[PDB]
Paper text:
Supporting this hypothesis, we here determined the fibril structure of two AMPs from amphibians, uperin 3.5 and aurein 3.3, by cryogenic electron microscopy (cryo-EM), revealing amyloid cross-β fibrils of mated β-sheets at atomic resolution. For both of the studied ffAMPs, cryo-EM data unambiguously prove an amyloid cross-β structure comprised of β-sheets with tightly coupled dry interfaces and strands perpendicular to the fibril axis. Overall, compared to other amyloids, the sequence content of the two AMPs indicates a dominant apolar and positively charged nature, which fits the functional interactions with negatively charged bacterial membranes.
Here, a cryo-EM study of uperin 3.5 in the absence of lipids reveals the presence of β-rich fibril polymorphs, and the atomic details of the cross-β configuration, allowing for a direct comparison to the cross-α fibril and exposing the substantial polymorphism of the same sequence. While the unique morphology of the most abundant polymorph (type I; relative abundance 71%) makes both individual fibrils in the micrographs and two-dimensional class averages easy to identify, variations between the other fibril types are more subtle. We find a propeller-shaped structure with threefold rotational symmetry about the fibril axis, where each of the three asymmetric units per filament layer comprises three chains (labeled A, B, C, along with their symmetry equivalents: A’, A”, etc.) of distinct conformation. An atomic model of the uperin 3.5 peptide built into each asymmetric unit (propeller blades) shows excellent agreement with the data in the inner section of the fibrils, comprising full-length (17 residues) monomers in chain A, and 14 and 7 residues in chains B and C, respectively. Chain C is almost perpendicular to the other two. In the cross-β fibril, Arg7 on chains A, A’ and A” is buried in the core of the fibril, while on chains B, B’ and B”, it is facing outwards, but with the charge being compensated by interactions with Asp4.
Numbering used by the authors:
A (entry chain A), B (entry chain J), C (entry chain S), D (entry chain Y), E (entry chain P), F (entry chain G), ...: 1 to 17
J (entry chain Z), K (entry chain Q), L (entry chain H), S (entry chain T), T (entry chain K), U (entry chain B), ...: 4 to 17
M (entry chain a), N (entry chain R), O (entry chain I), P (entry chain U), Q (entry chain L), R (entry chain C), ...: 1 to 7
The structure:
């Protein structure tokens, strides 16, 4: 819109043994 | 809209043994 | 809208042995 | 000053019929 | 000053019919 | 000053019929 | 961690006459 | 970590007369 | 880490007379 | 009959 | 019958 | 019958 | 609709 | 629609 | 539509 | 260690 | 270690 | 270590 | 004696 | 004695 | 004695 | 009369 | 009379 | 009379 | 003013 | 003003 | 003004 701000942070981990 | 702010943070873990 | 703020934080864990 | 924070949000509406 | 923060958001509407 | 932050957002609407 | 927030503000004064 | 935020502000004064 | 943010602001004054 | 039907609708979501 | 039907619609999403 | 039908539509998304 | 404004 | 404005 | 504006 | 998974 | 996965 | 995966 | 000793350790700090 | 000693260690810091 | 000693270590810092 | 008049002023706004 | 008048002013705005 | 009048002014805006 | 500091 | 500092 | 500093 007008002056909007968006932040996204994602972390994924898969340990298979 | 006008001056909006959005923040998202996600973490996922899968340990399979 | 006008001056809104939103924050989301999520954590998921699955330990399978 | 030191570490201050200020937030202002304003909305005005005028419907004339 | 030192580490200050300021945010302003404004919305104005005029419907004339 | 030192490390200051300023944000301004403005919206204006005029519907004349 | 996930979505954490930390704020610190400090002021020190020493007047010696 | 994931989506973390940190803010620090410091002020020091020494008047010697 | 992932999407981290850090801000530091410092001010020091020494008046000797 | 000058203006048989007149209608106004206003929606403001803020 | 001058203006048989008149209609106005206004939507403002902010 | 001068103006049989008149219509106005306004959409503002901000 | 029908709105009269005179100022 | 039908709007009269005179100023 | 039908809008009259006179200023 | 010793983990058996069958799906 | 010793992990057996069959899917 | 010792990991067996069959899919 | 097939597997004399088996050990698993999992630490999750979030 | 097939596998005398088996060990697993997992550390996740997030 | 097929595999006398087996070891796994995993460290994830995020 | 060595120092007839001495004055000090300190203002700190934080 | 050595120093008839002495004055100091300090203003700190932070 | 050595130093009839002495004055100091300090302004710090931060 | 008149300030004496000795350290 | 008049400030004496000795260190 | 008049400031004496000796260190």
């Amino acid at each position: 819109g007008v002056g909007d701000l968006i932040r996204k942070a994602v972390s994924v981990i898969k340990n298979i043994v």
